[PDB]
């Protein structure tokens, strides 16, 4: 339909993808580093979620260079997405209420 509305949803599908590839890539990068805890897929997915939302509790975090780079991408994707939905809600509210005048 509307650009902003489409870009938002596209941002959401893209998010889910980054979340999954994030889980895969994180484990791939962290495994091999002594003491690393981001080493099994199920928890790595939960790590990805709390990173993308930025709640970073943490209970798990990358410690290798590539794990951190993967973390940086997930952070930005999550922030961009959640930020692309706010702009879509602002476009909807503005354009709309503009009629209520």
């Amino acid at each position, epitope marked *: 339909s509307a650009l902003h509305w489409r870009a938002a949803g596209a941002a959401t599908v893209l998010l889910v993808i980054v979340l999954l590839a994030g889980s*895969y890539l994180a*484990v*791939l990068a*962290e*495994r*091999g*580093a*002594p*003491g*690393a*805890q981001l*080493i*099994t*897929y*199920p928890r790595a997915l939960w790590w990805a979620c709390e990173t993308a939302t930025t709640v970073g509790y943490x209970d798990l975090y990358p410690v290798t260079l590539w794990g951190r780079l993967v973390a940086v991408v997930v952070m930005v994707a999550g922030i961009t997405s959640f930020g692309l939905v706010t702009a879509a809600l602002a476009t909807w509210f503005v354009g709309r209420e503009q009629e209520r005048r």
Partner: antibody
Amino acid sequence: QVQLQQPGAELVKPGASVKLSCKASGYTFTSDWIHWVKQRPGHGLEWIGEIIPSYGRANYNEKIQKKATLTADKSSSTAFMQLSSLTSEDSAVYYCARERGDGYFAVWGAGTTVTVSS
Amino acid sequence: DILLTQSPAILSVSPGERVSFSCRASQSIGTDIHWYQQRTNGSPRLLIKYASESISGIPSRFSGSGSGTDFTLSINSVESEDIANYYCQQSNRWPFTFGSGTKLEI
């Protein structure tokens, strides 16, 4: 159907080299890691290393000399471990096991008995 | 590298009794512990995963408990087929590691 198939035994002369194999069956996912565990007679289990076939990357135990090199062949679904410059010390039973990226070893191979003698 | 300690190394029990093996982690690992069985001339067999979760195809006789650094694998009423070597393994931190082992004797 036996999930992992390994040659029953291998003989190697000191200083020589042998390449063990492990053919897998059943379901196969991108999240599969194949591990190699070494067991000397009368003793316990010793993690040697791991490899992720879908990507081809492997990691090895730092607390021990690196006699092994891991490789994988996607087409024939076989994982190989190249043991080099052996000695009586490298003589034991080598297992391969599969892990679904969740931390435990679901299934093991029968194990390949390796002997280093002249 | 997490050090898993299993003591004692040999456990002797009377038929039908209740036996308990213990694993001691050198640092908190949650419940990221798993147990294996290896009979003579055999290969390891997963018995319990994640400290408590039961595996399919394993007698309801086998159970596990613990969290942090202290874990226990129990057998309610042990029997002959249980004579073997039990090992624990952690997946909390890299690299995975194995316990020294415990032999069950009747």
